[PDB]
């Protein structure tokens, strides 16, 4: 996501924590 821990570009692609991407 863009909010929980890192970055901006995606509601998925959660590379900082990898486990949740619930879109």
Binding site for Cu ion (CB under 5 A): 1, 14
Radius of gyration of the chain (CA): 7
Answer for the pair 16, 6: CB distance below 8 angstroms, yes or no. Answer: yes
Cβ of residue 22: shortest distance to Cu ion, in angstroms? Answer: 11
Cβ of residue 10: shortest distance to Cu ion, in angstroms? Answer: 7
Give the distance from CA 11 to its chain's centroid. Answer: 6
Cβ of residue 21: shortest distance to Cu ion, in angstroms? Answer: 7
């Amino acid at each position: 996501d863009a909010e929980f821990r890192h970055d901006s570009g995606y509601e998925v692609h959660h590379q900082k924590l990898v486990f949740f991407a619930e879109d």
